[PDB]
Amino acid sequence: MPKFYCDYCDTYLTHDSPSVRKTHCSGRKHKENVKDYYQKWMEEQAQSLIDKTTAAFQQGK
Numbered sequence: 001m002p003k004f005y006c007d008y009c010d011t012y013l014t015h016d017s018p019s020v021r022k023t024h025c026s027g028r029k030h031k032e033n034v035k036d037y038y039q040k041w042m043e044e045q046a047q048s049l050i051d052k053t054t055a056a057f058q059q060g061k
């Protein structure tokens, strides 16, 4: 599966490498940006499953 995609940003990356993916996730704003993805999922508030995936993704303690 070439090319990478960020469901939180609704965009399609072109270089799915180990530095490009981390380069895309190298800004504290990316966390607040995720709220825009699940802001209207069901007219409610869902700020729990994000910490489980943002912290337990690959190398987060």
Ligand SMILES: [Zn+2]
Pocket (backbone or CB within 6 Å): 006, 008, 009, 024, 030
């Ligand atoms: Zn993103």
